Amino acid sequence: VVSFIGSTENDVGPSQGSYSSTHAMDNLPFVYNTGYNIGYQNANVWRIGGGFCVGLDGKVDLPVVGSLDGQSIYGLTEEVGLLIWMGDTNYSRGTAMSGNSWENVFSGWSVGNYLSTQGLSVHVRPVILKRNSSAQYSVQKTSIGSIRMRPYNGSSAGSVQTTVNFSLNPFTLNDT
Ligand SMILES: CC(=O)N[C@@H]1[C@@H](O)[C@H](O[C@@H]2O[C@H](CO)[C@@H](O)[C@H](O)[C@H]2NC(C)=O)[C@@H](CO)O[C@H]1O
Numbered sequence: 100v101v102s103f104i105g106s107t108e109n110d111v112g113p114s115q116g117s118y119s120s121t122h123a124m125d126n127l128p129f130v131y132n133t134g135y136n137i138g139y140q141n142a143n144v145w146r147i148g149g150g151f152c153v154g155l156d157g158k159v160d161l162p163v164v165g166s167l168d169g170q171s172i173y174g175l176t177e178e179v180g181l182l183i184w185m186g187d188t189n190y191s192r193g194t195a196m197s198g199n200s201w202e203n204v205f206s207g208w209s210v211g212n213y214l215s216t217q218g219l220s221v222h223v224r225p226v227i228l229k230r231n232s233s234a235q236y237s238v239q240k241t242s243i244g245s246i247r248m249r250p251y252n253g254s255s256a257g258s259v260q261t262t263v264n265f266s267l268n269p270f271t272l273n274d275t
Contacts, residue, residue, distance in 0.1 A: 100147065100148050100149050100151060101145050101146065101147040101148075101151050101153070101217075101248075101250070101254070101256065101257075101259050102145065102146045102147075102259055103144070103145055103259050103260040104143055104144065104145060104146050104216070105141055105143065105144030105145070105218075105263060106141075106263065107260070107262075107263055107264060108263075108264055108266065109139045109141070109221075109263060109264065109265050109266070110139065110265075110266055110267075110268045111137060111138055111139045111221055111222070111223065111243060111265050111266065111267045111268060112136065112137035112138060112139075112223075112267065112268045112270060113136075113268060113270075114268045114269065115268070115269060115270060115271070116136070116137065116268065116270040116271070117270070117271055117273060118131050118133050118136070118137075118225060118270060118271070118272050118273065119272070119273040119274070119275055120132070120274065120275065121275050124227060124274060127227055127228060127229070127230070128165070128167065128172060128180065128226045128227060128228050129226065129227040130167070130182060130224055130225075130226050130227075131224060131225045131226070131227070131272060132224065133224050133225065134222075135190040135220075135222045136222075137222055137223050137224065137225070137267075137270070138190060138220060138221055138222030138223070139220065139221050139222075139265060140188060140189075140190060140218070140219075140220040140221075141188070141218050141219065141220075142188045142216065142218035143216040143218055144216070144217060144218050144219055144248075144263060145216065145217045145248055145259070146214065146215075146216050147210045147214075147215060147216065147217055148210055148213060148214035148215065149210070149212060149213075149214075150209060150210065150211065150212065150254075151209065151210045151250065151254045152207060152208070152209040152210075152250060152251045152252040152253065152254045153207055153208070153209075153210075153217050153248050153249060153250050153251065153254060154203065154205045154206050154207025154208075154248075154249040154251060155185070155186065155187065155203075155204050155205035155207070155217075155219055155246055155247070155248060155249060156201045156202060156203055156204060156246070156247050156249050157185030157186070157194065157196060157201070157202055157204035157221075157244065157245070157246045157247075158199065158200065158201045158202065158244045158245055158246075158247075159171075159173055159183055159185075159196050159198075159199060159243060159244040160199060160242060160243070160244045160245075161173035161174060161175065161181070161199075161241075161243065161244070162174050162199075163197075163198065163199065164180055164228065165180075165228075166197070167182060167226075169195070169197070170182055170195035170196065170197055171183075171196060171197040171198060172226050172228070173196075174228070175238055175241060175267075176236075176238070177228070177229055178227065178228055178229040178230070178231055178236055179225055179226065179227065179228065179236050179238055179272070180225075180226040180228050181223040181224065181225055181226060181267075182195070182223065182224045182226060183195075183196040183221070183222075183223045183243070183244075184196060184220075184221065184222055184223070185204045185219070185220070185221045185244075185246055186204045186205050186219070186220060187204075187205040187218065187219065187220065188218035188219060188220055189220065190220050190222055192205065192220070193220060193221075193222060201247070203249070204246065205219070205249075207249065207251055209252060217248060219246050219263070221243070221246065221265055223243070223267065225238075225270075225272055227272070227274075234273075234274040235271060235272065235273055235274065236271065236272040237269065237270070237271045237272075238267070238269055238270055238271070238272075239269050240266055240267065240268060240269050241266065241267045242264070242265075242266050242267075243264075243265040243266060243267050244264070244265060245262050245263060245264045245265065246262070246263055246265070247261045247262040247263075248261050
C-alpha cells in the first residue's frame with residue numbers, strides 16, 4: 100500500500116544563493132563544486148507498506164548542450180549550464196542525469212510487512228559555458244524537471260499521485 104505525503108512543487112537550493120570559487124577558470128566548461136548545497140531532499144514523499152515495491156524515475160526538461168564525464172550538461176543560459184543528479188533520499192545516492200527522457204534514478208526497494216516511506220533528492224552544480232566581463236552571473240527561477248515513484252514487482256500506484264516537480268531557486272555566481 101502507498102499514499103502521497105509530500106509536495107508537488109519543490110524548490111532546489113536556497114533562494115538567492117551565493118556561489119563563489121577561487122579556482123582560475125582558464126579552461127571551460129568550468130564546474131562550480133557546490134557539493135549538495137543546491138538541492139532539495141525529503142525522506143518522506145510517499146508512505147508505503149505491506150510488501151510494496153517502489154523505485155524512482157527522474158526526468159530533466161532543460162536542453163542538453165553537451166556532456167562531462169558521461170553526464171549531460173543542461174543549459175540555463177548561453178553562459179551557464181548545470182550538471183544534475185536525481186535519486187533516492189540520500190544525496191550520495193544521486194544518479195547522474197543525461198537526456199530528457201524518463202530515466203531510472205533509484206533501482207528501488209520493497210517495504211516488508213510494515214509501514215515506511217519513500218523519499219527523494221535532487222542536486223545540481225552550475226557550469227560556466229561561456230565567458231563574461233562582469234564575472235558575475237545571476238540565474239532566475241527555472242523549471243528543472245520531475246521525479247516519479249515507480250512501483251514494481253506487482254505493486255501499483257492506483258490513483259495515488261506519482262509525480263513531483265522541481266524548480267531551481269534563483270542564485271548568483273561570483274567568480275573571485
Ligand atoms: C536498512 C534499512 O534501514 N532499511 C529500511 C530503510 O530503507 C527505511 O528508510 C527509508 O528508505 C527508503 C529507501 O532507501 C527512503 O526512500 C526513505 O526516505 C527512507 N525513510 C526514512 C524515514 O529514512 C527505514 C525507515 O522506514 O526502515 C528500514 O527498515
